[PDB]
Scaffold this active site. Structure first.
Site, PDB file in Angstrom:
ATOM      1  N   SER A   9      -1.775  -1.283  -2.933  1.00  0.00           N
ATOM      2  CA  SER A   9      -1.697  -2.790  -3.199  1.00  0.00           C
ATOM      3  C   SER A   9      -0.572  -3.062  -4.339  1.00  0.00           C
ATOM      4  O   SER A   9      -0.721  -2.355  -5.294  1.00  0.00           O
ATOM      5  CB  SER A   9      -2.932  -3.419  -3.236  1.00  0.00           C
ATOM      6  OG  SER A   9      -3.834  -2.625  -4.126  1.00  0.00           O
ATOM      7  N   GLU A 151     -17.546   4.530   1.282  1.00  0.00           N
ATOM      8  CA  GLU A 151     -16.625   5.159   2.415  1.00  0.00           C
ATOM      9  C   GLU A 151     -16.966   6.441   2.868  1.00  0.00           C
ATOM     10  O   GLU A 151     -16.743   6.668   3.952  1.00  0.00           O
ATOM     11  CB  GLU A 151     -14.948   5.128   1.851  1.00  0.00           C
ATOM     12  CG  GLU A 151     -14.838   3.546   1.403  1.00  0.00           C
ATOM     13  CD  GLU A 151     -13.783   3.664  -0.032  1.00  0.00           C
ATOM     14  OE1 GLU A 151     -13.730   4.537  -0.609  1.00  0.00           O
ATOM     15  OE2 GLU A 151     -13.239   2.384   0.182  1.00  0.00           O
ATOM     16  N   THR A 224     -11.856   0.881 -10.512  1.00  0.00           N
ATOM     17  CA  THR A 224     -12.287   2.225 -11.186  1.00  0.00           C
ATOM     18  C   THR A 224     -11.898   3.432 -10.419  1.00  0.00           C
ATOM     19  O   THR A 224     -11.233   4.077 -10.652  1.00  0.00           O
ATOM     20  CB  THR A 224     -13.921   2.043 -11.424  1.00  0.00           C
ATOM     21  OG1 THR A 224     -14.429   1.691 -10.256  1.00  0.00           O
ATOM     22  CG2 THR A 224     -14.179   1.105 -12.595  1.00  0.00           C
ATOM     23  N   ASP A 226      -9.063   3.525  -8.439  1.00  0.00           N
ATOM     24  CA  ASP A 226      -7.964   3.426  -8.292  1.00  0.00           C
ATOM     25  C   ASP A 226      -7.320   4.074  -9.502  1.00  0.00           C
ATOM     26  O   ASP A 226      -6.325   5.110  -9.482  1.00  0.00           O
ATOM     27  CB  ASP A 226      -7.016   2.138  -8.203  1.00  0.00           C
ATOM     28  CG  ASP A 226      -7.278   1.398  -6.972  1.00  0.00           C
ATOM     29  OD1 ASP A 226      -7.741   1.927  -5.879  1.00  0.00           O
ATOM     30  OD2 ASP A 226      -7.600   0.066  -6.977  1.00  0.00           O
TER      31      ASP A 226
END
Ligand code: ADP
Ligand code: ADP
Ligand code: PXM
Ligand code: PXM
Ligand code: CA
Ligand code: CA
Ligand code: CA
Ligand code: CA
Ligand code: CA
Ligand code: CA
Ligand code: CA
Ligand code: CA
Ligand code: CL
Lengths: 287, 295
Positions: A9, A151, A224, A226
């Protein structure tokens, strides 16, 4: 060889995605070639989010220019983050395969594909189930995956709540075809003041596993993961993966402890700390 | 204090627009809030250029997000470069005015709007013709402008060929309403480039000139790093020293680009500015160009 294609992003305000990843990698001497999967006013935690989201055609258009100008062999590293689009997640697989082929034709070292399967956090999914399955497929092609515990839990269907269950979740990633997995943090009922991480490295069929902890700091932080994945790419270029995880953890601990003194990481404010963290986390082999 | 709204291009490959401006400003301790007017594979110099271009609606959509979250009063600096969209260029004046009003409502000092009128280079427009007049209209609302000599020439209709002609072009900018103008380089003496800084209060004009070594070859992104460096130095230097330091940054950057094999005959890729190569030299250049008063 310090050239990363970063598919993440863009936000005008704040530090997530390519806004969290680019400055750290540039500081480490990397050229970051960013494809911005979205271009938004700010991250999804503010009251108002506005802006543009890529579709598949926009992604394949950018790829067509990268291809036409012969840039694809430049990408020693591919780093994927926030995409939140089934069609683009699937398309990354072809993008990585085309980079691998261009580099192999030019006799360069294999690309390293770091897949951050960005889907949610704190028990909340921000994508459709179709994105979950698209990440299960893409991970058949990843060199390194850096899921958060949420995830890792939804991809493997193992609730990651401790080291045993982290290992079962990691083992799923290996079976799927990702050789190197970092479960970046999970809380432990039996050790409330720490977060534990796991580094799992499948070869022989043998698995080398490493663990350690960081202090469990109060509060919630955006970006964090990223900054963590970007820092991991930087350190893993010159360090064995265990020491690279230790440095990346130390970078995150300096940034969090700074924020507490002094939710948004001030990634720009401590450039020394991004390159040489004040301490490294111990990353110790499991027997 | 050190927050910039930067309205410029994004490229995946290479170093122009927001990619070129952002790293320097971050190293100087600025938060750069980037609005990406285009999202392209690479700069316009390559045989092929692919990707997405904002329309006015995409620009006002981002502005609504910035407005609704009360971010507009944060912008002590506004920096515009590559837009290439007549409607978005026109809309920057309203954006800046809205920021100035938000800042006064918070008892903050007024913003400084740096307008790089990005249109062309090497005697060729790479923007639509419509965009030239839209820049004339926006420049009346700019605090600082940083045209290359081609942009100064097409805006003022004066051929910037020498110091006297650069001065006539700068006087046009001041009459238009732009108080501070930097014509970044012009033409004896083949081995140097000359620059002009012109500051109109008073009704009086203080002018300065200086030179930098001319390097053989065409560079892209040099204006974009220069304007970003100028915002960074002008935050804590008088404009003449800030021009001197920004010239110095560019000389180090071009020398590092040449030294890593980007000579005048090398590929476009080889000539891309080595923006990440010497971060210390982005903050503290090895030389500061002299910026000397004219009589
Ligand atoms: N509350 C916390 N206390 C300490 N470290 C944290 C905290 N939250 C994040 N981290 C650090 O940031 C890294 C990445 O954050 P994590 O939450 O695991 O990923 P994500 O941001 O993707 O959800 C962790 O490995 C750890 O170093
Ligand atoms: N060939 C060159 N040799 C030396 N300095 C250069 C050269 N090209 C650009 N520069 C430097 O970069 C600055 C901005 O470049 P210029 O060409 O004037 O603007 P733009 O890149 O917008 O056309 C100049 O002021 C100068 O310091
Ligand atoms: C656009 C975007 N990218 C990445 C992340 C994850 O750090 C978030 C969530 N704040 C987000 O909103
Ligand atoms: C997209 C873009 N941005 C900015 C500039 C100015 O240096 C150019 C031209 N290279 C361009 O093509
Ligand atoms: Ca988290
Ligand atoms: Ca979080
Ligand atoms: Ca994440
Ligand atoms: Ca030029
Ligand atoms: Ca007019
Ligand atoms: Ca004016
Ligand atoms: Ca040029
Ligand atoms: Ca320019
Ligand atoms: Cl445990």
């Amino acid at each position: 060889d310090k050239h990363v294609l970063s598919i993440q992003s863009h936000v005008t305000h704040g530090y997530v995605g390519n806004k969290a990843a680019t400055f750290p990698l540039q500081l480490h001497g990397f050229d970051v070639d960013a494809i911005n999967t979205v271009s938004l006013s700010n991250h999804s935690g503010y009251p108002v989010i506005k802006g543009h989201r890529m579709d598949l055609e926009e992604f394949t258009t950018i790829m067509e220019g990268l291809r036409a100008n012969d840039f694809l062999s430049d990408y020693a590293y591919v780093l994927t983050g926030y995409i939140n689009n089934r069609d683009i997640v699937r398309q990354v697989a072809a993008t990585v395969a085309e980079i691998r082929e261009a580099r192999q034709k030019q006799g360069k070292k294999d690309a390293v594909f770091f897949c951050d399967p960005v889907m949610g956090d704190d028990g909340r999914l921000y994508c459709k189930e179709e994105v979950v399955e698209a990440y299960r497929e893409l991970l058949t092609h990843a060199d390194v995956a850096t899921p958060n515990y949420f995830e890792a839990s939804i991809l493997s269907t193992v609730e990651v709540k401790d080291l045993a269950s982290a290992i079962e979740a990691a083992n799923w990633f290996h079976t799927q075809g990702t050789p190197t997995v970092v479960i970046k943090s999970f809380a432990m009922a039996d050790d409330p003041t720490h977060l534990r991480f796991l580094l799992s490295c499948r070869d022989t069929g043998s698995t080398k596993r490493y663990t350690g902890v960081v202090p469990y700091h109060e509060g919630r932080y955006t970006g964090t993961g990223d900054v963590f994945a970007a820092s991991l790419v930087a350190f893993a270029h010159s360090d064995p993966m265990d020491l690279a995880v230790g440095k990346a953890m130390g970078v995150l601990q300096d940034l969090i402890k700074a924020t507490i003194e002094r939710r948004e990481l001030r990634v720009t404010s401590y450039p020394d700390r991004l390159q040489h963290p004040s301490s490294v986390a111990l990353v110790t082999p499991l027997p």
